C-alpha cells in the first residue's frame, strides 16, 4: 500500500557439494568441480600408441633371446607391457643393475639386432645347455655365444670390433659362474678366469667367483649379464682368458618416447593418450588417483580421490 | 508469505543468477536476478580454474627439482607424493577460501549499492531488506534494480511517512 519492502538475497541449492577452505574443513557450496580422475575403464587402448603385449616374455628375456621369446626379434614398440605371468625358461641368470638395462632398452623402443663377425680364435663357439633347449636339441640365448676350450687350451682372447656407424651400439655379454672347480677347469682350463670389456671411454673388469647357488632348472650355476655402449669413433675391446659369454653383435639404440609398464590389464581397441597399469584413463582433469605410474599426456598423480574446487557461493538452505 | 533477505536465508527459487531482488508492493510480489553482480563473480571464477592449474603445475616441478637434487627408492618417492599431495590440497583450499570470500563480498557490495540509492528514503530492516517508505510500484522497483533511482523525487513523500510513526 503506502510503503514497500525490497529484499536482497542470493541463490541456493537444496543439496550442495562439500569442499574445503582455509577456515572450514567441510563447507557446502552451490557448485564445485572435480579435479581428480579416479576411475579407469580397466583396458589399455591400443591407439594411438603402439602397444606390444609381452604375454609370457619379459623385455630382458626377449633381449637375450630366450627360446620361447624368439618371436620378439626385431620387434618395436611405444609401450612394452610386461605381464606377471611372464617367466624365464633359459639358463639361470642375474643382472647387476637390472633396472637400468631394462629402462635403457625400454627407452630405445626396439630390439633391432645386427650380427657382427667377431673372430674367436682358439675357442669353441656356440655352447649350449639342457636348461635352455631350443627345439628338440639343446640350446642357448640366441644373442649370446658361449665360448669354451678347444682341445686342452683356452687362450687369451683379444678381439676388437670398431663402431664406424653414426649411432650408439649396445652390446650384451656375460660371465659364467661355475658351481665347482672341476667344472671351471673342464670348460675354461684355467683355474681362475677373467673377462674385461673396454672402450675408449669405459672399462669393465670382472673376475668370476666360483660358488654354488640355489637350483634353478636343474642348475646350480648362473650367468651375470653386463652391457656396454660404444659411441661412434669408439671401439669395443674384449679380452678374456676364460668364462666369457661373448656377444653376437649389437642392438641399434634410439632415443624416443618409449617406455615399459608392468600391468595385467587386457588390451582393447580404443583411443587414449594416457595409460596406467589399471588401464587407460581420460586426461581431461588435471590430477588423477588411479596410479602413480603413467604413460602419455597424463594428469599428475595425487593421493586424494577427490579435490573439489569451489565454483559457487556458499549454499545455505532456505528456511 | 513475507520475503526475507540474505542474512540467514538463501533463495532456492532463484536460478537466473546468484544475487537478486525480491519485493512486496501494491502490485503484488516479485523477484528478479541481478546480472551485473552475478556476472562479476562469474568472471573471477572463470579465472580460477586456470590459476589453480598454472600454480599446481609450478609446485609439481619445484618438488621434483628438490628430490632430483637428492637423487628413487620407494620410501623416498612416497614421501615426495605425500608432500605434493599435501601442497595440492592446500592450493585448492586457499582458492576455495577466496571463492567464498569474493562471493560473499559481492553480496555486501550489492546491499550497500542499494542502501546508497535509497539514501534517507528507506531504512535497513536488519534481515537484508529495506523498508522503502513510499509507494514504490513495479516501475519504481526496476529503477532501483537498474541503478537510476532518484531519492529526491520521493524525499518529501518518504520523509513525511517516516515522521508519521
Amino acid at each position, epitope marked *: 500500500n503506502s510503503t514497500a519492502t525490497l529484499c536482497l538475497g542470493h*541463490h541456493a*541449492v537444496p543439496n550442495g557439494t562439500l569442499v574445503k577452505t582455509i577456515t572450514d574443513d567441510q563447507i557446502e557450496v*552451490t*557448485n564445485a568441480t572435480e579435479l581428480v580422475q579416479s576411475s579407469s575403464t580397466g583396458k589399455i587402448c591400443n591407439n594411438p600408441h603402439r602397444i606390444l603385449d609381452g604375454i609370457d616374455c619379459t623385455l630382458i628375456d626377449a633381449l637375450l633371446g630366450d627360446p620361447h621369446c624368439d618371436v620378439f626379434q626385431n620387434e618395436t614398440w611405444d609401450l612394452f607391457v610386461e605381464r606377471s605371468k611372464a617367466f624365464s625358461n633359459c639358463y639361470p641368470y642375474d643382472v647387476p643393475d637390472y633396472a637400468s638395462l631394462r629402462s635403457l632398452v625400454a627407452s630405445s623402443g626396439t630390439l633391432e639386432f645386427i650380427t657382427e663377425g667377431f673372430t674367436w680364435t682358439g675357442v669353441t663357439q656356440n655352447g649350449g645347455s639342457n636348461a635352455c633347449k631350443r627345439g628338440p636339441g639343446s640350446g642357448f640365448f640366441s644373442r649370446l655365444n658361449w665360448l669354451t676350450k678347444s682341445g686342452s687350451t683356452y687362450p687369451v682372447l683379444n678381439v676388437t670390433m670398431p663402431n664406424n656407424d653414426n649411432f650408439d651400439k649396445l652390446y650384451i655379454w656375460g660371465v659364467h659362474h661355475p658351481s665347482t672347480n672341476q667344472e671351471q677347469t673342464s670348460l675354461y682350463v684355467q683355474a681362475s678366469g677373467r673377462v674385461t670389456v673396454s672402450t675408449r671411454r669405459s672399462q669393465q673388469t670382472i673376475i668370476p667367483n666360483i660358488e654354488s647357488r640355489p637350483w634353478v632348472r636343474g642348475l646350480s650355476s648362473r650367468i651375470s649379464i653386463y652391457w656396454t655402449i660404444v659411441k661412434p669413433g669408439d671401439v669395443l675391446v674384449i679380452n678374456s682368458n676364460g668364462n666369457l659369454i661373448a656377444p653376437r653383435g649389437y642392438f641399434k639404440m634410439r632415443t624416443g618416447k618409449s617406455s615399459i609398464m608392468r600391468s595385467d590389464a587386457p588390451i582393447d581397441t580404443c583411443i587414449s593418450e594416457c595409460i596406467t597399469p589399471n588401464g587407460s584413463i581420460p586426461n581431461d582433469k588435471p590430477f588423477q588417483n588411479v596410479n602413480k605410474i603413467t604413460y602419455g599426456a597424463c594428469p599428475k598423480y595425487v593421493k586424494q580421490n577427490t579435490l573439489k574446487l569451489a*565454483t*559457487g557461493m556458499r549454499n545455505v538452505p532456505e528456511k | 508469505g513475507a520475503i526475507a533477505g540474505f542474512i540467514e536465508n538463501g533463495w532456492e527459487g532463484m*536460478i*537466473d*543468477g*546468484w544475487y537478486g531482488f525480491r519485493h512486496q508492493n501494491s502490485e503484488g510480489t516479485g523477484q*528478479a536476478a541481478d*546480472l551485473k553482480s*552475478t*556476472q562479476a563473480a*562469474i*568472471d573471477q*571464477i*572463470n*579465472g580460477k580454474l*586456470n590459476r589453480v592449474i598454472e600454480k599446481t603445475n609450478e609446485k609439481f616441478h619445484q618438488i621434483e627439482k628438490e628430490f632430483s637434487e637428492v637423487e628413487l627408492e620407494k620410501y623416498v618417492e612416497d614421501t615426495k607424493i605425500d608432500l605434493w599431495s599435501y601442497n595440492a590440497e592446500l592450493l585448492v583450499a586457499l582458492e576455495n577460501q577466496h571463492t567464498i570470500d569474493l562471493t560473499d563480498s559481492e553480496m555486501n557490495k550489492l546491499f550497500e549499492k542499494t542502501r546508497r540509492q535509497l539514501r534517507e528514503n528507506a531504512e535497513d530492516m536488519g534481515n537484508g531488506c529495506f523498508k522503502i517508505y513510499h509507494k514504490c510500484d513495479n516501475a519504481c522497483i526496476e529503477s532501483i534494480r537498474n541503478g537510476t533511482y532518484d531519492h529526491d523525487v520521493y524525499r518529501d513523500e518518504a520523509l513525511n511517512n517516516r515522521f508519521q510513526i
Partner: antibody
Amino acid sequence: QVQLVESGGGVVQPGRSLRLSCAASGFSFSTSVIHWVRQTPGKGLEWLAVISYDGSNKYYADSVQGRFTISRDNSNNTLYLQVNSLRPEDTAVYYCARGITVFGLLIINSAMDVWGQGTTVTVSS
Amino acid sequence: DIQMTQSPSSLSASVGDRVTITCRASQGISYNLAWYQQKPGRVPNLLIHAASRLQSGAPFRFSGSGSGTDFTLTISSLQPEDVATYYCQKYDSVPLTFGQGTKVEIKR
C-alpha cells in the same frame, strides 16, 4: 534424441508479420534459456534475441528492436519468434538454440549448445 | 557497444598444419567468449566456451587460449574434417555479438 525442431518459415510480402515456432523434445524444456540466430545467405551468423527460462525477461539485438517478439508456452514446449514489419534484411535462415548452464545457473547470457535445423524466411511479393 | 573483429577472414592450410584464428574485442569481456564451428550444410556446433573450455564430443584438436580483448582459437594437426567456417561469439552482456566469420579450407 535431445532435439528441437522449428517451423513457420516461408514467403511473406514486405510489410506483414510472421511467427516462427521452436518445438523442444526430449529434455527439461521448462529449465532452459533459448536463443534465436539468423544468417544472411552465405554471410555470417547474427544473434537476434533471448528469452529467460520462464518468459519474464527478453532482450533483442540493436538492429532488431521494435519488430521482433520472443515468447514461450512452457506447458506447450514451444518458443516463438514473431517478426514484424519485415524488410530485405530478413531473408535468411533462422535457428533456435539452447543456452548452457553456467556454474549451475540458468544464466541468460551463455553459449548455445543445441541447435535446430532452421526455417528459412524470405520477404518478397 | 563492443565490436568483435574475427580474423583472418579466411585461409587455406595443409593437413597436419597448425592453424590459428584470433577474435578481438573493442572492450574487455573477460572469459565470456565462445567459439562455434559450422561445417558445410550442417548446423553450427559449439566448440569453445569460456574462452578455453572444450565442449563434450568435440575433437581435441581444438583449443582456445585467450582472455580480455584478445582470444585465439587454435587447430593443431589440422584434419580434412575441419573444413568449415568458424565464428567467435561475445556473451559478456547483450548483445551477444558474433564474429564476422572465418572460412578454413584445405590445401592438398
